[PDB]
Design a binder for this molecule. Structure first.
Ligand code: ODY
Ligand code: G9J
Ligand code: CL
Lengths: 220, 238
């Protein structure tokens, strides 16, 4: 059924799955409390990504274990798009570069986050595109790791071809030429490589992580 | 000159500029210790790096950048670049990595170094994926150039914006080149989009392997790992 979705239906479902923008309640305390609350919505958001519930729980948890920080980051970067120089962690928590210095080592990631946000800005990324990218992150990041082993990986890649299709359909409908569609597709997906980088540097900086058993409980 | 190339001229440019396959140090002690295996791999990686600098200077658009940005892009990209070279070389060797034609290692010989087994398995997996996708050489040289230009672009003023804008134009051209090969090979427009995406999603995996690898090299206290920024600017000169 997830494989039979049209482009419009794919977008419509992902737009409906979007978690809410939460509010903040030492600076690590705030961000952590916040990220924990965003995490719970993310689990329930992931179950509404088409094709995700068609996976075993082992593979749902593995995809979530490899993607959770990329997912928080792309959401953060998206929120902040219309607030240059600042990171809109929450509407009552708009931090700038310099306030990143409050915590040692945080400055570096803060600046990468900002740059991404500026990149999305000057590409003028759309909310329709955003939700497609966020799902690609979910499905794509942990997939490169028996009877179920091959069938699941194939399913995931066929879904990903569908989100590709969606992204293209959206671009065509927006008035982009074929060449322009290809290019914008590549530009968006190359930015994902930067978000992986940021996720690894942030995951390193946090050394405070969802364990395999932890996430398995939340799906159920 | 760079943005005036055609698809065909771009491929040829990148194909001609490919660096050579090199051999490991000959007649090392086998089996290896955790030290000697790293010594062989490190001697080999260092030697590849010199060829990579001269390769980087032939990727269209790269020399058009100031010297500070060229060194920045290489700092960010060098291990990703060494890793995709490896993955490619190891495509027709299931379950094995072809570090050198005289150094073909399986999963078990990665256990010889604490922590390498993990990275090893990520490299094998990526290698299989290229095999199943049937990655061509023409596509490979585009992906390699894409890693070089893109990995560091989002991390560096009127001119600092001119340099980004330029890099993205070249990148936009390598993308056209990728598509043009896919069309020339006779894939449908849909198939073309899906393959382009599958390929660029893999770069995301390569970046993850490169960060982990970078973490691993720092882990076992290798003084010094990584080409320092100091080091690459030396080699970039003439
Ligand atoms: C990019 C970013 C942060 C960010 C992330 C890394 C570095 C950095 O400088 C900022 C921290 C953060 C992220 C994750 C985090 O996870 C903690 C793990 N949880 C505690 C539970 C187990 F005890 C699971 C803590 C802080 O705050 C955020 C948010 O609140 C919401 C969205 C993005 C971020
Ligand atoms: C991927 C890789 C290494 C590798 C693989 C797994 C883990 C790891 O830390 C390094 C290791 C390496 C050792 C020292 C340095 I300085 C750089 C790379 O040896 C290599 C040689 C050539 C090559 O193309 C890739 C590698
Ligand atoms: Cl939205």
């Amino acid at each position: 059924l997830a494989l039979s979705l049209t482009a419009d239906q794919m977008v419509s479902a992902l737009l409906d799955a979007e978690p809410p923008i939460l509010y903040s309640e030492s600076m690590m305390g705030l961000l952590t409390n916040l990220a924990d609350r965003e995490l719970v919505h993310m689990i329930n958001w992931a179950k509404r990504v088409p094709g995700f519930v068609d996976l075993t729980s082992h593979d749902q948890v593995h995809l979530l274990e490899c993607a959770w920080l990329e997912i928080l980051m792309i959401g953060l970067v998206w929120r902040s798009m219309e607030h240059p120089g600042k990171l809109l962690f929450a509407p009552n928590l708009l931090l700038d570069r310099n306030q990143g210095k409050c915590v040692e080592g945080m400055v570096e990631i803060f600046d990468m986050l900002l740059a991404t946000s500026s990149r999305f800005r000057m590409m003028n990324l759309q909310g329709e595109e955003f939700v497609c990218l966020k799902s690609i992150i979910l499905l794509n990041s942990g997939v490169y790791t028996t009877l179920k082993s091959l069938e699941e990986k194939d399913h995931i890649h066929r879904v990903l071809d569908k989100i590709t299709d969606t992204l293209i359909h959206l671009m065509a409908k927006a008035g982009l030429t074929l060449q322009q569609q290809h290019q914008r597709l590549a530009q968006l997906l190359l930015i994902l490589s930067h978000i992986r980088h940021m996720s690894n540097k942030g995951m390193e900086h946090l050394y405070v992580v969802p364990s395999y058993d932890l996430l398995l409980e939340m799906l159920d």
